[model samples]
Target: GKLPPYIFSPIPFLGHAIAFGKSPIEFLENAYEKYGPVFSFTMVGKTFTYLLGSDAAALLFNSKNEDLNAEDVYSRLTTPVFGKGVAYDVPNPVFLEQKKMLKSGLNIAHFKQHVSIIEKETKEYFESWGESGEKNVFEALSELIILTASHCLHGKEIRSQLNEKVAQLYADLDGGFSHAAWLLPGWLPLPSFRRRDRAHREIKDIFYKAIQKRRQSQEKIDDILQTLLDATYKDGRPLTDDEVAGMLIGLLLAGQHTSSTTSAWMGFFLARDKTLQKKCYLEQKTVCGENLPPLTYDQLKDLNLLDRCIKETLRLRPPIMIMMRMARTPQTVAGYTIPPGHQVCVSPTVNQRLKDSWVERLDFNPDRYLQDNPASGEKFAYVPFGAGRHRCIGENFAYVQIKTIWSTMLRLYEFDLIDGYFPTVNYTTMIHTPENPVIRYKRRS
Candidate 1:
């Protein structure tokens, strides 16, 4: 009837931003408890209307782009980071075509190759850990993912272009997600704002340099960079040097964050829960070799318990929690008339954890995703990869990457959560990187 119930935050102009930004999953969980499935909360000057459950998720996911456009909602945050004329910055049809161009790069064949590449990167990075000792899980996984993403998604030659600059650039860019400039305008003179812009330019130039070198070479490489270069729009035009670079920017940032976070979560859950670790070890022993050897795509695929561990980690802590759209025109949905220019969001974190769908929703149990678990038949109940067309293009790639990292580690070492270290999710940005997660590992004898 009326607009969805609005949360009455005590402070004006900061409505819900402080609470939501502190911990989005917890914020939404409490919100869903009080407000039912739909509600509105303000962030800075912008008002975001939330639709909490799977039904609302389906409605929002399937809504016409013209009516609830993504660009109008996300371009403010994404465009500066990804650059102009790509993804949400382009028109609906253009973005649709742009996304399709990416599909060629993410297909099965490329992914299979990526498994070996991921193992290569994972082992190469783990070598720095000297077979055993303490390391920050978040820090270690972040570096490993950048290496994997650079080699696999960015191409084998990408290391030459991306170099050590990649991690620093991504950090600066990520900081902008919560920076004041994001809420207002990116042009502000704030320190975070300046770093964000600097990072964007530097990162774009890195990709541009990589693309240029690829173009000059006569050799063909099987990677996203090459597919993008060879791909033409329906009009037979190619993405410009800047446009191509933009694509990599979006692709690498996403792959790195998601892969790293999920891997860390999987490690944490397996370490903290010895039962889960034993099951993973059994699965690895049966499917993969008992001792250390690089995990192939087939072997990783068959590591079913490890896969369930990763899946359950994603369920508990999806890298990105919200899907945003702007109401381009007034529409009636879930018995409320959403007004134009208002932001509409659906939180998969909240939806995936619903008590109605998931038994013992707060517990970290990977078995729920296993066969014969009650979660199998619940439609739209699990949405770690979002839903509909905008679902993560790297779903298969991520699964392979995470599996490779976990299986390889399981063979080489056993991780134990650092004593007194129960880490919490950092919601200052869209990507839910677990803050300060430490793990101690002892090499298997």
Candidate 2:
């Protein structure tokens, strides 16, 4: 019937940015407890209204784009990083069509090839680990994600050309999605901002040349790059080279942080629990073969125990802790009217762990997912990949990539925690990664 209750803050200009930015999960959890399911809090000049729990989250997930829009909220953060005229920078209809084209590329046909490509990439990338030692698992997985994604999504041209130098370009572009970049204007004289712009230009030029050459060649390639090249709009207008380049960049950036973080967290989860780890390893063998050959798409899907482990990892430590949208028009949810320009938000982290829905919520038990839990039969209860209109396009590809990597890894080594030291969530970055994800591994005979 009225606007949501606002959390009182002492500072006028820089409201609750300090508290919220330092530890977002804790802040949001505290706010959710105090303010209940719906509450408004100010961060800098922007007023954010958080809808906690699945029931409230459905408002943001189910509402129309015209009512609660994603472009207005995400474009500033994504456009500079992904480049102009693609993703959030384009109109809703155009972006939807573009997403469809990208999705079409990620079909079962491509995923069959993707599983092998990822398995090989994982095995080769881990060769430097040298059988047994302590190393940063997150760092290793982050690097491997780019390599596998480039080969699978970016095509042979970019994958073959990807050296450490070109890879660093991606790092620089990725650095742009910081708290400062989100809060401040892009024109600000900051080193991260400058690096992001430079990387965008360089990567675009690389993709443009690759596209030009692909057009001239008669031989066909199977990748997202080729998919974009062959894509046309509803009116039969072909995409420009710039659009294709931008889309490619967007696709890689979208999954990189998420998959890597999830992979790392899942690794730690598997390492911490010996029984669960062994179960997953044996599940790989049982699902595939006792000898444990290369993973196929069908085998990856049947790895139920391993799949549950990944699901539980995401439940506890979802890479994207928050999903946000700017209200374009007045909208009502739970009888509260959210006016235009308010940033409507949902946190999958909070929703997935709510005591109301989950039993022994803090425990790391994948078996909890084996039977009916409180979260079952609920549409938005488990929204690690989000829900409704804007669900992630690269979800199936991510599962394939993560599963294949882990399947290969289980065969190669026996993983364990570093002397019972498990990494805590690093809340500083946009995607919540482990603080120092170092783990020990020994080669299996």
Candidate 3:
């Protein structure tokens, strides 16, 4: 098997770092156009072998970690924020066990309660906004996602403690995922690294007392914290306090970035199309009745049009643009071997809208979902939550969270783009966030 085609770079060490860093989708698309499905290019001295389009995407999506591992690529960035003994900081089997335990906690019973919690949290969070004025939809939703997630996933104790100081710590810890943090040695005394390290310590200490109190009491709290506290490994080793704390940090941070960005994008999409927005608003009443009673988990599931908007949003602007895994064993794709020592990657943003894979690919029509999607038979075609062995555990929860919030929002207000202006994709961060995410709204009478 021969190596994948390499995109020759003008600069040696910097490689394609500056171009890719400035505009990843453009860089990757240009490379794909020139080199076809499989290609290798260097960024900051590390060679990345990209698997573009649905057919090529299967290589990364369907891979066993042994073939293309996650820990080696993600651990340095994750280990500091998530702390020492959970997520990518641990062995694959151990991480999988933890993921399973979290999955159990995020079950139907919890989500049944979560719909109302999210609705209430969304309503209460927006109380400060008065009736109507322009607001940064992204900033507002980002804050609300943390609030709703804390109430639903972290339990009341942690939610009570999530004051401004603690929120700032979470922000600092989240700063650990910066591009420099990923490309450079994490041990380097960078200011962001120091903030991340300090915040990780403070947040972990904040969790220790809560864990001890929960352990001492016989309280039957129904949140992920209790689930982890009561969980045990296959060998009957109960999770330590530190491990539970780290897992909590990891879970919240995982959902926060992606969910907030997706929610914001969905909001803008709804705003851009008034007809679609009105139909979505009417659908809430149609699904839940004329009075539009409080949304049930069942009702949220049935808001089919709203669901499609969310789907369309993710299809257009997936939060995590590039999903990467290190090559453990040499992997073959498109008749080229992505040899060991290269990081294999897939871009959902690219595959979801490739000219050949999607019909009218750039159009923002949610109704296109009604007919046979060009991606119907394709497995990895639409991967906002990713696919295969490491498919995001939070997909179901994300759906419930976004649907509930939007259902409540649609009932309360009518949205329009600020002067018919839609924001462009801001590629400055790790996530593909909206630039200048401002939207106009009027409270529904």
Candidate 4:
């Protein structure tokens, strides 16, 4: 059993400060080079032991050990923003029920109902883009995702009414996660703290109004909000308005940042790799004959190459780079002893690139995820949505979301990277987004 004085303390904090100032991926890469896979550090006054390789991440994230709990980590991190009763104090059964409701909302019937909405909203947003020119893809994607999510999650009428306020609130909410002020117990009035509070209030007000209107309406609406309204808890009781609001906030918060980042990176990679971009364009053209409408779920399924590209993008640049788990008791993992109450950080970013997992870990080879590749044998090695009980329940939703954005954009426009325009990464919280993701987009002639 190895021990504490493993690495220096104050200097590691300096490293953390530098990481906050610069790119997190670069920081982690530097740390991995100097300290190897398993390294200890102190950040925000908490001790964390990070495990980088695939074998190690699998052992921690995929384990059935009762100690590894997602709710615990989320609660600790989000309490300052979500408040006590709003996040953690809610019954576990309530969250489970909400998850079930979300799953049902993603079923074939629901997806088919939302396809037209996605298509209509997507086209509407695109038409608003004047004559297709260069713009910040991240900003554009944020608008697109908000439109899609709002129309699909709530009704189109509600979305049109709330779009502006919701977009601002979303931006504010995202900005809140860029620091560690949440971990501090001080009552000092910080800019981040004020922004978070304001964002939370804005979200709650909008959701509460929607819930109230839905309750008074006689007609049933076929949207995600309706699904949640109709869903029953394990005890057969219907969800309260507060519960429904909480679930909606969670979904919006969880979905928006990650999906936007995925879209941005997809644009970045395709612009950088012309061969891959051309391949995707050809595949899109072949899959959907010229002048075919926006893709449906069934059509998306047929675009196997597009699926491979999305999977490869996620494998290379997952939104959530590291997942932290705490042990309830001492646990033995890969010949190392993890003491109780210690936080174990497992990162899929480093793991998926293991030399054993893929033939050429450094190459941009989407074909490795194709059915015929030998590297595809290790299913657990590639976990962009993570693994085990706490894995993202909306994994399927994300697939459709990403596929739709990529398919539609690739078909409508041709993008190119401006010379010397490589943007540095910003690892604020979970998502790895570009600091300045500016690209040129022109309508395909």
Candidate 5:
């Protein structure tokens, strides 16, 4: 019935932003150690209450939407990127249906197609590099994931437009996702604001025309765009073109950020130890046959070592620093009552690394996920894709994309962290990614 203890930082309006942005995982881990599981801190005039640990993670994710509104906290930022009438801007029931519609596009058949596209894209891009050199891996991985998602999720109409001539449009659109946008309004009249708005309109127009073209041509495509176009709202009518566009923008952005960061982090980790890299490579080789042919969705699942490496990266470098939801009704969590209108948060990045849940919390060990002698981590401790009714529908899609890319690369090349601190992280944005990191690759002779 009592509120959680407060973390009164000396700076005003800046509050915990300085510390948290400086180093997110360390700040939260130290705070968790000092303040126990539940605690509150201020950021940009808002007080955020964080629930840490696996138990709190489950409680935070499983809480009813009526009690904790994600839209209230996230609307301003998400609206600019996704347009209006979808995602966090809509009512909970409508959002639920939207999620269901998006999930339909990520089914087995879609992934089966996704793996083929991703494998082709991965090999084609790497082959262009000509036996390996130094690459700005963060940007490289970002480009790869964007291409894969655009090709697989957007159908030929939207994806075919993503050629080298105007690929900068998509880059500009994604650049609109900024930390300042998260803190302030997108209508602030800054140069970045203008760029973001311009890019959003351009991207939206592309999607709208795609929908319009499909309607006239009556095309049948095996992609998310087609699936969402055919999906109906709760009232039993097909979604409006704008609604479909908004949904596509939202889903595309979600996949871009999360998948990009996950794959980049995995590459960094695999480079850290040669044995682990070789183990995954061996698994890929043995699993895919001596020729190392094209991968299938089912074969992606069988590459257990690659699966574990991805799992380990997600544990250490989750995309979101903290999942946010604003309390609409008084609720109790871990002996503390969250008052209505207060923002509630949980750190998957922190929970996944909890010492109580993970025996070797700081170590990068993929073997923990092995079924034979699994890591002693508790449930809810490893939710990079999130959980509950709002859990990511593209978990399988993400893994297949990551595996297709990694298995192909790992089998053909060995990566070496182009020799520095290896990675620099920025957690200010919605999704955190390493910056200025280089990974040098040598063709497997």
Candidate 6:
């Protein structure tokens, strides 16, 4: 077990400062090269041991021990946004109930319905962009994701209102991710604190109003909110409005921001690489044909190349690059003992590059995901949605959303990077977004 040299004392409040400010993948790659896939670093007085490589990552993530809990890490970061006692501190029943509801919402029937909504919303969202002008693709796509998620989560009215509130909430939530004063024990009155407070109030108000509207109307709607309203827990008791609100907010926060960031990266990749962009376009054209017009759920399925492109973007630049877990009990991984209360980190960005898992590991080739080389063998290798029970509930929904945006944009516009455009990326919290992603888009004749 010749592990890499350990950094005993990471600079205060800057454990990940250097990496967070730059490409996290590069940072981790450097660590792996020096440490041979298992290394430890100190951040904010905490020692975090990373488990890299395909075998190590698989073993650690697939661990059934209650000790290796993902909720613990996510709860710490997300509780501030979703409120304490809402994420991991809640009663086990509440958490289980929420998981069940989310599972129900992602069924095949529900997925089909969501796809229709994605297609409709994509058309409307694109239409709203006017005849095209220069705009930040990430910002525009992030807003569009909020709009689309709103429509799929509820109906049109609720979708419209919630979109604006969620946009504001994203701003507040994002502001809170800064390293400044994050390690404080209690809610200190920082500017981010105020933004978070205001965002919480707006989101609560919107959720309450949507709930009331749904209750008053007798129409049966096939939306996530309605499903939650009608869903019965294992005890056969219906969820209260408060519980519904918490669950809805969790889904909203989790679904919207990450989806938006990934969408942004996908847009960036396709826009920059003309050959890949053209490949995606040709696939869409062949799948839908000239007279096809608007894309449908069936077409979304047949556009294998587009799906591969989305998968490839996620592989190269995953929104959630690192997965953090806390060891609740003593355990050993990769010949290293993880003591109780120790932190463990696994990164798909690192594992996806393993020579064993992927052919031409560093290349951005979408054909790797075609029918011949499906992603089945490399299950643990591709974890953009994460692994185990805590995996993303909106995996299918995200695929549809990303596909719709890429397909719609390809058919409509030609995107190109501005002259001397070399964008920098920032790794704050769960997302890996460009520090300043700017591009010029023109309508395709």
Question: In candidate 4, what residue range of length 10 has the lowest lDDT sum?
Answer: 4-13
Tens-digit lDDT track for model 2 on 1-445?
4999899898998898888878887898888888888999897888999999878898999988888899988888888888888888988878889889999998999999898889899989999999799999999999999999888989878889899989999999989888888777777889998888888899999998989999999998776777889889999999999888988898788767889999999988888898888887778778787877777999988988888888898899888888899998898877799999899999998898887888899888989987888558577778899886788888899899888998888889888998798898777766877988998999964
**Which candidate, 1 or 3, has the higher TM-score?**
3
The residue-by-residue lDDT of candidate 4 on 53-72, one tens digit each, is 65556667666546665455
User: Which stretches of candidate 5 lie above 4 Å from their native place?
Assistant: 164-166, 183-187, 371-377, 428-430
The lDDT-based order of candidates, best leading, equals 2, 3, 5, 1, 6, 4
Which residue pairs clash within candidate 5?
A: none
Cα lDDT of all candidates, in order?
Answer: 0.79, 0.87, 0.87, 0.71, 0.80, 0.72
Which regions of candidate 3 fall more than 4 Å away from where they truly are? none
Query: What lDDT tens digits, residue by residue, belong to model 5 across residues 5-106?
Result: 999988978888777778878888898999999888898778988889877766678888888878887777778778889887888888889888888878
Q: Is candidate 2 or candidate 5 better by lDDT?
A: 2
lDDT of 6: 0.72
Global CA lDDT computed for model 1 = 0.79
Residue 403 shift from truth in candidate 3, angstroms? 0.8
Give the clash total for candidate 4: 0
For candidate 3, write residues 295-331 as lDDT tens digits. Answer: 8998887889988888898899888888899998988
Residue pairs whose backbone atoms clash in candidate 4: none
**Per-candidate TM-score against the hidden true structure:** 0.93, 0.97, 0.97, 0.89, 0.94, 0.90
Which ten-residue region of model 3 has the weakest summed lDDT?
A: 373-382
Supply candidate 2's per-residue lDDT for 364.
Answer: 88
- After superposing candidate 6, which stretches have Cα over 4 Å from the reference? 1-5, 9-21, 91-94, 128-133, 163-166, 371-375, 420-422, 428-430
Q: Give the TM-score of candidate 6.
A: 0.90
By the lDDT metric, which is better: model 1 or model 6? Answer: 1
